[PDB]
Amino acid sequence: GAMALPQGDEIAYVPIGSITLESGAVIDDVTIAVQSWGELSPRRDNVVFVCHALTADSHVVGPAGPDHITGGWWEGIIGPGAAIDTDHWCAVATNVLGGCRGTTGPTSLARDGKPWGSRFPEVSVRDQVNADVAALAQLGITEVAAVVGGSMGGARALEWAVMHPDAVRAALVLAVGARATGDQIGTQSTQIAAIQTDPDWQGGDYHGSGRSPGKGLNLARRIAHLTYRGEVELDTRFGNDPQVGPDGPEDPWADGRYAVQSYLEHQGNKFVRRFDAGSYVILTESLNRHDVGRGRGGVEKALRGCPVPVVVGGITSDRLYPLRLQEELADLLPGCTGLRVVESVHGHDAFLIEFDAVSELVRETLALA
Amino acid sequence: GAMALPQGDEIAYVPIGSITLESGAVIDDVTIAVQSWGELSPRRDNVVFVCHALTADSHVVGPAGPDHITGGWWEGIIGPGAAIDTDHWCAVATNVLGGCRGTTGPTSLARDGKPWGSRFPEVSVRDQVNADVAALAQLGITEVAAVVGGSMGGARALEWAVMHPDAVRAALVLAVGARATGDQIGTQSTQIAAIQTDPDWQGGDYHGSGRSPGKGLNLARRIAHLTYRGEVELDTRFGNDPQVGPDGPEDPWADGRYAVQSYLEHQGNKFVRRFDAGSYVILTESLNRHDVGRGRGGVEKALRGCPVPVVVGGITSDRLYPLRLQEELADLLPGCTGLRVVESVHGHDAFLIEFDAVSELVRETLALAK
Ligand SMILES: [K+]
Ligand SMILES: [K+]
DSSP, X not given: OOOOOOOTTOOEEEEEEEEEOTTSOEEEEEEEEEEEESOOOTTSOOEEXXXXXXXXXXXXXSOOBTTBSSOXXXXXXXXXXXXXXXXXXXXEEEOOTTOSSSSSSTTSBOTTSSBOGGGSOOOOHHHHHHHHHHHHHHTTOOOEEEEEEETHHHHHHHHHHHHOGGGEXXXXXXXXXXXXXXXXHHHHHHHHHHHHTSGGGGGGOOTTSXXXXXXXXXXXXXXXXXXXXXXXXXXXXXXXXXOEETTEEOOTTTTOOBHHHHHHHHHHHHHHTTOOHHHHHHXXXXXHXXXXXXXXXXXXXXXXXXXXOEEEEEETTOSSSOHHHHHHHHHHOTTOOSOEEEOOSSGGGHHHHOHHHHHHHHHHXXXXX | OOOOOOOTTOOEEEEEXXXXXXXXXXXXXXXXXXXXXXXXXXXXXXXXXXXXXXXXOSOOSSOOBTTBSSOOTTTTSXXXXXXXXXXXXXXXXXXXXXXXXXXXXXXXXXXXXXXXXXXXXXXXXXXXXXXXXXXHHHTTOOOBSEEEEETHHHHHHHHHHHHOGGGBSOEEEESOOSBOOHHHHHHHHHHHHHHHTSTTOGGGOOTTSSOOOHHHHHHHHHXXXXXXXXXXHHHHHTTTOBOEETTEEOOTTTTOOBHHHHHHHHXXXXXXXXXXXXXXXXXXXXXXXXXXXXXXXXXXXXXXXXXXXXXXXXXXXXXXXXHXXXXXXXXHOTTOOSOEXXXXXXXXXXXXXXXXXXXXXXXXXXXHHO
């Protein structure tokens, strides 16, 4: 019969067998890491599937621990009486295909007894969706009430709705576009270059070598983190202030740092301790090939042809997925009644920070379901 | 007698002696590279000083040629009948202190016969103004009719106007802010890190070693280039198209590149062949140190106290020095009657591309200097 759902901090590892990718290549022996909160209803029709973003994982809520290097990335969104109210809904989240937090990816051991590494194939967002759908099938779940996500999570949710409109009752698509843009591919390809030019990248087969491309991954994360924040907030929070230490300001003209510089350095250092460079490359490449129109006659035809009820949200200060992209989605999707604009200074990261606004968008989506 | 001004493509190398910087550090034996166009008046009062931006040089107009690895970066702005009309004005431009196109910088040889390299002291925008003023004095010039610049050049022009209001009759401050911002220091410090973490940076003393931090400088330039362009521009020009070469389209599902990726790579590759990594770091740190308010009671006090008439311009699509920064400049400077908005898809780089718009701003400025 079906595999049982885990609960809470517990990760279930769901084998889905060999999978055929959009490219026609095959990945053998794929395992999908899954977490869940709330009881699955008898008819298995109350699932809210949460698609995590580029550097997040299946741990949507909960504490950090030996199984969870980071705490929940959407704290308070899932729980009793929360937006995803676990008294009524069953929240489910996977780690994306190509990830490094339990699902098969570059750090995983392959059949030949060596890390996947450079042998891990290129994947698309559609491959990621179909791996999640396959995992749900192994859990006995053949439809979802809603699929929700922001950023790369929004790309997954959008493709899911377009690919499986008869198996989704509603979707939340937050802070993403219908396809990768020139600016996105520009910065993302530069981040990949920072990793791959690091001497310890070793062609991507550094796993188990004792060395890793930490300097390159650190730089890649710093590049990305700026794209995730708002321009004004960076100037009001940091401006050109020096870093303030316990007993006073540093001197940026000597050995000291600017406050924004110290902030970015700390973000980069923490990230390298928590994330795999090869996964970062695979997942960033999947974002570069995000395109809901591919094989479907273009973006307009694909979106106009999707009947799923959809809440589309965008953020005023988002510099990576600017509001014009969500205006396009909201216009073209016939199941979207109009763009929801999140007013926030926090840039793209507002979808993680603006608790009340995001809760309202999630509640609206589940009401549609 | 005062040193003679050069003309046209000719570079003059003006010694100004040893200089003490704002930090207290010293640079021995500073030499400033200078170019000039047009005749200096008998009163020596018709100089229009052009401040170049981060990766530009003294060669404001003219072709690439035997002595100029790049052609003029503001072609058509200087000449007979042009916006800087050499029938009336004497245009002068230096290579900035810390640069790598003729003026003393980290590639220059120090008194021990090795490049300054890691010994080159960090400079501020104010140091760069003081060095240009010192070079002008060696050329017999103690005042300028106008000082003009965009981007880093705008920071130099703004500081010059605030520092020497008695010796400037007008300024053009284009596509810059009153101080470095959080986002600017963020991206600039990351560009510096790309260079300094390169395995061949060697603390900045890579010269003559057989290894150089070209890969890191290439990455730094790609990061910067994105900040210089417009978001919509990049999506309309490249979108997610694959690169097309002589033999057809590349395939990003395998080893091929996207068109925007190939564009950035090519920009980086060309750049590393004609710019020095240590100079890039020094000049980028000078931008981190830009702050017209320092030692003057803050930005608002410094700007409100500047009596120079100023044309402030900003670009609608600029992502590095967004329009809100020029709105602040235009509001606080009493010599600005209102922001001039340049409509362009090209982002920050519009100040180099939008010739008609920039020509108009330069003409407006020089009319205020008369
Ligand atoms: K619609
Ligand atoms: K004013």
